[PDB]
């Protein structure tokens, strides 16, 4: 979630050169500068007589965004005899796989063709060039004398490459032994020392290789993808390889011992032609020092909402345990035909939380099929199934799909800010894009209020301007922010305090600040990283006890803090980020003191009664009708108490009787809303316990239909309370005469 997407470092190569097909970081151990290693397998080099041999370019990140090729090989095709080209470097796809350790760079040409030492042939044995800064050697393990389709002649070594912790090169060629595939491991020191240009079939000591198998294992493509991790007791790196056509095109992943190339564990796909093993990643995702296996199946078809198979892709996450057990879960794709499991790139601890993260890309997803990359954050229980960030391709297809996300590289801090970066290569548009992770600021915000129960009678608070001595209560909010990586000590926060949250819908606001005299207050903070709770005191005063609508709804206090984003690392403005899984707001509740028994809620008992005193009215006249209504609450306080007299279509209201002291002068109104006309009269806010009301309402009735025979009223008291807020409905009938 902390990757910077607004201003990424965009790199461009020659048109049609497949620039960005392979990406990597170059971090020399003798220099403070870092470079991007971008392979362009179809680029035109300066080799004499070689067309589209491909090249690997190192790109300067500090300035000018310049990319300059690395001269692994400057000579053209060697000759076996006078007129007998020994090798064929044209269209060799050099740069299709780039790997880099501290000072070593491993670039391979899987489609490199060789004329063997026996007969004039063209065998894609594949070749690699290992550069140790000063000395560039050639590594061609599959250029041996076992040369045929049933040997290593079509091995295509360097299709997938990797580096182990013990300075070993894991090489995968999926063509060996009639396309069964092969894994070849060699020590880097042995490769450098044993190099000699005159000999082409160099035999390296201490080389670990997988042997040929039975013919029923043909066309399995072992070595299509490779990964390194530790999956047994010792510290050596074992060999994870994807075998996407194995088990009757079901797909398999072979884990081999890193010490003697012995089979360790197996993964098998659940669907055919899904390419289980197209991409393999090995990283610890739950932070317990056991490497986990991530296997992509970009062609996987799952059941949709209508039960039809849809090609969305899938990634299988297997968590390594103390024993050889693996806890396997599945991550399905989000868009059809997007090839979700195409590339899986470990990101390290992208947010410096404690668990490593991983990036999964669907290079044909998103709008216009540009490409999409998903970032998943590791948790203690595994991987979060919901991605936290979405990276979208921003370049349209020229002749071929942009394939944004076809290759990604991460887990390297290129700007020394403490967080790992991520390079994404879109070889369809010949682009390489560097995304920088932003510093994550974890904020522990608090909001303390003086006792939540507010007493309206307790009014020991002075006021400015008038000093009306009305009740008041305090609010205290504290802010502390800490984070890892490069981050200036003092961070600028602005906090806003809004009263009456969840109730502010154009209605009245009851809680007002003592000095600002406004429900909304905003204050800017300048707090330090790793500092104490910076707490400030504010005073808020309530309105008059008989001013706001009601005292039942709790007063809600809302604080919203946001980070001022002019916080740069003096590098083109890499702003920090707040933690995604933190509350950006904190809200507290304040209540009003109201005597409502021990249960803290007022539960009234509402009763209504009425007598006729006329018992008959004559049809032809406008008869004055006075109804004597008794409204009593024998329960507790009734908030916003009014009686509802729903008169029929016949009569209308005249006025309250005020000529006698036995009845009351209730404030009354005529209402017509919502298809029904009725009379309301205020009964007191609140309507106190045991209060017995008695009053009369004058009317005037004139019959509508000549056969009506009765006039029926309906009386009901209701309040805004939460329980027992309504009286039983009483219907009074007056007979027409």
């Amino acid at each position: 979630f902390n990757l910077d997407v607004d201003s990424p470092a965009e790199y461009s190569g020659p048109e049609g050169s497949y620039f960005g097909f392979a990406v990597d970081f170059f971090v020399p151990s003798a220099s403070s500068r870092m470079f991007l290693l971008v392979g362009a397998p179809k680029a035109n080099t300066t080799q004499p007589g070689i067309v589209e041999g491909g090249q690997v370019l190192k790109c300067d990140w500090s300035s000018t965004r310049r990319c300059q090729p690395i001269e692994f090989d400057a000579t053209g095709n060697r000759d076996y005899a006078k007129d007998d080209p020994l090798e064929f470097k044209s269209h060799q796809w050099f740069g299709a796989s780039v790997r880099s350790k501290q000072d070593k760079i491993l670039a391979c040409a899987p489609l490199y063709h060789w004329r063997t030492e026996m007969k004039q042939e063209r065998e894609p044995v594949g070749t690699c060039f290992l550069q140790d800064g000063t000395k560039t050697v050639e590594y061609a393990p599959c250029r041996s004398q076992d040369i045929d389709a049933d040997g290593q002649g079509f091995c295509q070594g360097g299709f997938s490459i990797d580096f182990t912790k013990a300075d070993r090169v894991l090489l995968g060629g999926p063509g060996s032994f009639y396309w069964q595939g092969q894994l070849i491991s060699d020590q880097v020191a042995e490769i450098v020392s044993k190099y000699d240009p005159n000999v082409y079939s160099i035999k390296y000591n201490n080389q670990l290789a997988t042997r040929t198998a039975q013919a029923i294992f043909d066309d399995s493509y072992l070595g299509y993808s490779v990964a390194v991790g530790d999956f047994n007791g010792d510290g050596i790196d074992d060999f994870v390889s994807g075998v996407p056509r194995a088990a009757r095109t079901l797909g398999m992943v072979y884990i081999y011992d890193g010490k003697n190339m012995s089979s360790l564990y197996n993964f098998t796909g659940e669907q055919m032609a899904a390419y289980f093993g197209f991409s393999v990643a090995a990283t610890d995702i739950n932070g317990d020092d056991y490497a986990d296996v991530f296997i992509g199946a970009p062609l996987f078809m799952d059941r949709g909402s209508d039960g039809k198979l849809q090609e969305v892709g899938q990634v299988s996450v297997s968590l390594q345990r103390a024993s050889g057990d693996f806890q396997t879960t599945k991550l399905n794709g989000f868009e059809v035909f997007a090839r979700f499991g195409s590339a899986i790139a470990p990101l390290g601890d992208l947010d410096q939380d404690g668990f490593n993260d991983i990036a999964i890309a669907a290079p044909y997803g998103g709008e216009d099929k540009k490409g999409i990359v998903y970032i998943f954050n590791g948790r203690s229980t595994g991987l979060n199934a919901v991605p936290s960030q979405i990276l979208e391709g921003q370049w349209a297809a020229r002749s071929m799909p942009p394939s944004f996300g076809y290759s990604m590289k991460g887990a390297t801090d290129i700007d020394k800010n403490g967080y790992p970066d991520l390079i994404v290569g879109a070889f369809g548009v010949d682009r390489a894009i560097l995304y920088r992770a932003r510093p994550v600021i974890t904020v522990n915000a608090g909001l303390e209020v003086y006792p939540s129960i507010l007493n309206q009678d307790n009014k020991t608070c002075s006021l400015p301007g008038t000093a009306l001595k009305v009740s008041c209560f305090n609010v205290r909010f504290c802010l502390k922010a800490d984070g890892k990586g490069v981050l200036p000590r003092k961070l600028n926060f602005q906090v806003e305090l809004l009263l009456d949250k969840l109730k502010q819908k154009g209605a009245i606001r009851r809680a007002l600040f003592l000095y600002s005299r406004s429900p909304s207050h905003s204050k800017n903070m300048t707090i330090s990283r790793g500092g104490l709770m910076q707490c400030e005191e504010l005073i808020a005063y309530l309105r008059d006890e008989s001013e706001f609508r009601d005292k039942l709804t709790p007063i809600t206090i809302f604080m919203e803090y946001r980070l001022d984003y002019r916080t740069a690392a003096d590098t083109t403005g890499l702003q920090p980020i707040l933690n995604q899984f933190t509350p950006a707001n904190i809200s507290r509740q304040a209540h009003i003191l109201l005597d409502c028994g021990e249960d803290n809620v007022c539960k009234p008992k509402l009763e209504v009664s009425v007598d006729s005193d006329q018992k008959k009215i004559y049809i032809g006249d406008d008869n004055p009708l006075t109804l004597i209504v008794k409204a009593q609450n024998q329960g507790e306080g009734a908030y916003e108490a009014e009686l509802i007299v729903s008169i029929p279509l016949q009569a209308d209201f005249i006025g309250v009787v005020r000529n006698n002291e036995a009845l009351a002068r209730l404030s009354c109104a005529f209402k017509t809303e919502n298809q029904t006309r009725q009379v309301v009269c205020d009964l007191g806010n609140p309507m106190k316990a045991g209060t017995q009301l008695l009053a009369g309402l004058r009317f005037s009735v004139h019959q509508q239909s000549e056969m009506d025979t009765s006039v029926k009223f309906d009386l009901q008291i209701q309040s805004s309370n939460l329980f027992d807020k309504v009286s039983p409905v009483v219907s009074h009938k007056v007979d027409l005469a």
């Binding site: 295509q156 390419y275 090609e311 090839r339």
Partner: protein, 465 residues
Amino acid sequence: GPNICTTRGVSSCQQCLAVSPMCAWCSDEALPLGSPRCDLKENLLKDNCAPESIEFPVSEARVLEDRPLSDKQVTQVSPQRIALRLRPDDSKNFSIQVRQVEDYPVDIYYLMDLSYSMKDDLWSIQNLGTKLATQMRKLTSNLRIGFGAFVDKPVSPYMYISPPEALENPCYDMKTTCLPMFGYKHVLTLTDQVTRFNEEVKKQSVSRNRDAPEGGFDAIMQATVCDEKIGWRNDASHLLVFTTDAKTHIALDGRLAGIVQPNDGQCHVGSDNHYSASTTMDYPSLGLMTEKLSQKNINLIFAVTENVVNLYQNYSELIPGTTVGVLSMDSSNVLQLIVDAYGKIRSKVELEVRDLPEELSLSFNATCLNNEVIPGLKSCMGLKIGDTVSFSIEAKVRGCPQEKEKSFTIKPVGFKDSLIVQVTFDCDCACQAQAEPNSHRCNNGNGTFECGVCRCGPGWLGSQC
């Protein structure tokens, strides 16, 4: 008693006829002035009006040609010539029956694996093609057939790119002659010439490549998406028969050959009848293949050898709507699959009306196989050869035009036969032909007298001027 006839048709005979279907007119001078001249026929008889002077034409349907629906020219819609006589503002109903007896049009495209592993199955695949043509010729009378071929993508490491003599002869290393390698070759367009199909099928020979998996899914996609090239008919059943004897290359297999561009599903077969994007586009995926097959309504059939029957059965499980058969010396399995696919063809009878007059209106009742009359519906579904369906159509005309004769054709969509009508609007009375020009008979006045009554001109508002 007083009715809509006595209130609208009292003007004259044609208007009385136009008022209502049950309005009747009296053309007898014996009827005294004051009694209604337009009323019920029973009312007119009660009013001692002469039956010969009663003009009550009843709308009716006169069938002209009613040769029965044929059974297995064939008669496919009965009746086929119905004469309609409609008085103005009247509705009349007639019944038709549509029976599907013409055989289904079927398009069969045959895909042959012409690789070197098929050297011992070439005879089997050719015999399968000939037996397919014969079986559908005996099954349906409207068969269109054609075929194509595939080997694999013509690039390294699949092709033998060395020595230079191996480009035109891939069997140079083994000292034999074979055809050059190709990706996909559309050999014969969908044609009704079964003899031509047999000759072209028998003329085929195999080619050679290196690895066991083949590029048959590329050929499947090309034959599915190149409608103009293959010759698919829109109003027909499409069967694609895929023949092979080995595993198949799938999507993402092309990265070994250097092909990283996904298949886009477009047509790439030019005038040379070759897959021009074979060396630049990756093999198609199962999802894209299924989507294209569903879009083009093509029934894929796998005619594979025994060693790959289970593999292609699982593939067909991944591709719904696909059947798998065993290719061998005898073609019984594939022929049975073809027979079942033909038997799973269901036809729909969509009623369409052409050049219907604006004044006329139609209402449709569908009596489908459920035997439940569904008003407002005109196209039953399902249906098989010989199966019959019936419709009840009621025609109503607003007033009457001056054409005095209209005709429209009722046709079922996709059916050769059709039903025509002869809508003869009465729009007037038989006694009106014997009308009297003006004055004379209508007393001393100068109005006009017809059908036993007189109707004066402007000014004269009297009964008889």
